[PDB]
């Protein structure tokens, strides 16, 4: 019943403020992280809190795709198989998608920038289009 | 790739313990909140959320999937096989907070000698952390 972001300064409602579809894809993000820091994600380093959070998070995706594969092998009935795989993939992935983007933001562009950009994007989307600046706020 | 490396632990070392040794999830959970509700601390935050999300999957499965047969396949899996890693992780992390790391590692290593020793030559005592 705890919010992972509370200690870092963010909150679940703040993330819910932005549209759901805005967040990037899963495989892309994973590839981005691997290309970025294979050493960091593999090498043991003290402190590095967001890296420790990333390590812990990736295990969720790994375990979920292992259960997708298990469902693929077993559970002969087509009807249940499609429902279970579809939930394993699309429905639950939103929280993971949010966690990875939030963390990656802090590592590359800093926490102050991502925190200030989160509210600004919501501000820009919520008001009428005509009276807002053209275009959308660039990350950095 | 493996949680245990950063904390000076090996997945092989951690596997050296037998499966039955780790306790159940329900019991381990209670002490975690009551005594430590307040770097390692985060890992617990993540693990509790993981278990909560699985339990949430269980109830969703229970509500739909009207076929009685298919329920057990997933329910037993998530409540037995999926949770062994959770049982391992909670104990491994809690030990760090409750007792010292230096004592912990020495405890872990000696258990290997204990299992290696034949049952015939196993001493009458049970190695306890104290």
């Amino acid at each position, epitope marked *: 019943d705890i919010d992972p972001y509370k200690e870092f300064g963010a909150s679940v409602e703040l993330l819910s403020f932005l549209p759901s579809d805005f967040f990037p894809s899963i495989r892309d993000l994973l590839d981005t992280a691997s290309a970025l820091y294979r050493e960091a994600l593999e090498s043991p380093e003290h402190c590095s809190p967001h890296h420790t959070a990333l390590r812990q998070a990736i295990l969720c995706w790994g375990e979920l795709m292992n259960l997708a594969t298990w469902v693929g092998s*077993n559970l*002969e*009935d*087509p*009807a249940s198989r499609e429902l279970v795989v579809s939930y394993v993939n699309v429905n639950m992935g939103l929280k993971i998608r949010q966690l990875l983007w939030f963390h990656i933001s802090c590592l590359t562009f800093g926490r102050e920038t991502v925190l200030e950009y989160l509210v600004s994007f919501g501000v820009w989307i919520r008001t009428p289009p005509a009276y807002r600046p053209p275009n959308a706020p660039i990350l950095s | 790739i493996d949680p245990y490396k950063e904390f000076g632990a090996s997945v092989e070392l951690l596997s050296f313990l037998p499966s039955d040794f780790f306790p159940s999830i329900r019991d381990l959970l209670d002490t975690a909140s009551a005594l430590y509700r307040e770097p390692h601390h985060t890992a617990l935050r993540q693990a509790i959320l993981c278990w909560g999300e699985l339990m949430n999957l269980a109830t969703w499965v229970g509500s739909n999937l*009207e*076929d009685p*047969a*298919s329920r057990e*396949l997933v329910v037993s899996y998530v409540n037995v096989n999926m949770g062994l890693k959770i049982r391992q992780l909670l104990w491994f992390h809690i030990s760090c907070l409750t007792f010292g790391r230096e004592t912990v590692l020495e405890y872990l290593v000696s258990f290997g000698v204990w299992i290696r020793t034949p049952p015939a030559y196993r001493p009458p005592n049970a190695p306890i952390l104290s």
Partner: antibody
Amino acid sequence: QVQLVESGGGVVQPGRSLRLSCAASGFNFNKFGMHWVRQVPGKGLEWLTYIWYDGSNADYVDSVKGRFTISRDNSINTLYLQMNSLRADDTAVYFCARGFYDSSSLESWGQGALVIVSS
Amino acid sequence: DIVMTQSPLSLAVTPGEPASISCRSSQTLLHNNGYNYFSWYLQKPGQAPQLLIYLGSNRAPGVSDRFSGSGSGTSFTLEISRVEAEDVGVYYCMQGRHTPWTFGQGTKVEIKR
């Protein structure tokens, strides 16, 4: 309890083709599969074919392979079995059933209808 | 593809005594879920078939406890503790491991004259 009623059974002249009617109600047709069972007098049950909920896949036995076809219309929740190239060995009563014990054995069986061919 | 087999073909039972019938299958039915796909059906003259045992060793809903069965792998047996006058019929066993589905040969019961 679900109740299924068939229709369209009767006598057919030799050499022609006939189509049988098997409609169902009281449960989610889109969430379960259907099967066809046949019984000529003197022998026991024999499996013929089945279709999955989507209908993309289907299977057939070698006795009637390539000469029978099955299709479903989820709009009205009605089964369909088409018969062509009927023979004297095909004179039997036909049953349509549904299986839901984890996709293995049929659970509710319809009343069935008999098909007879002769001159 | 699967060859089914049943035995004995006939068995007349004095009612109130136990009896056992055996159905055998060629290929193993133990899937990777620890379950065995085997069936027990009951058929009555002028009536539609009815279920006896499901999933190998679980009783179908509403079926009386007078019928029980067990077994695993390639061997199974149907056991009836007490025979009642309404138990007369022809029994069947079926396979659902691999498509296409195959049925047995049948077993009809009666009263010893």
